[PDB]
From Swiss-Prot, chains A, B, C:
Coiled coil: 4-33
Subunit structure, as described in the record: Oligomeric complex of 4 set of homotrimers.
Source species of the chain: Homo sapiens
Protein localization: Secreted, Extracellular space, Extracellular matrix; Secreted, Extracellular space, Surface film
Function of the protein: Contributes to the lung's defense against inhaled microorganisms, organic antigens and toxins. Interacts with compounds such as bacterial lipopolysaccharides, oligosaccharides and fatty acids and modulates leukocyte action in immune response. May participate in the extracellular reorganization or turnover of pulmonary surfactant. Binds strongly maltose residues and to a lesser extent other alpha-glucosyl moieties.
Entry PTM: The N-terminus is blocked. Hydroxylation on proline residues within the sequence motif, GXPG, is most likely to be 4-hydroxy as this fits the requirement for 4-hydroxylation in vertebrates.
Note: Pulmonary surfactant consists of 90% lipid and 10% protein. There are 4 surfactant-associated proteins: 2 collagenous, carbohydrate-binding glycoproteins (SP-A and SP-D) and 2 small hydrophobic proteins (SP-B and SP-C).
Family: Belongs to the SFTPD family.
Domain of life from the UniProt record: Eukaryota
Protein name: Pulmonary surfactant-associated protein D
Section covered of the full-length record: 220 to 257 of 375
Amino acid sequence: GLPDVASLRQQVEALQGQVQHLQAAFSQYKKVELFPNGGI
Amino acid sequence: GLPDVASLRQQVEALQGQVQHLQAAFSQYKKVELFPNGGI
Amino acid sequence: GLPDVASLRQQVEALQGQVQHLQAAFSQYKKVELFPNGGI
């Protein structure tokens, strides 16, 4: 129905909420690969 | 057209599919920064 | 209004732009957990 149409919009805000907090956590993991392990 | 309108909804389900499997993989990388390298 | 309706579509393309570049960066961090630290 109509309400659900606009309700998919809030579900869409939810989807962007997931990507934003994933970029959030990612900020830490972002500076994780720069000094990795190597050699023997 | 109309069909494409609803087809953009399946495309949005695709977008959430990407973020969900990215959070999936992330679960592993999520416990990656806690014991990083350091010192000299 | 109508314009804003379609404007939410471009905002939606923005959302997929975030997840695509996050998968981009993630490709590097993806091969980060395979040789982590361990032991004493």
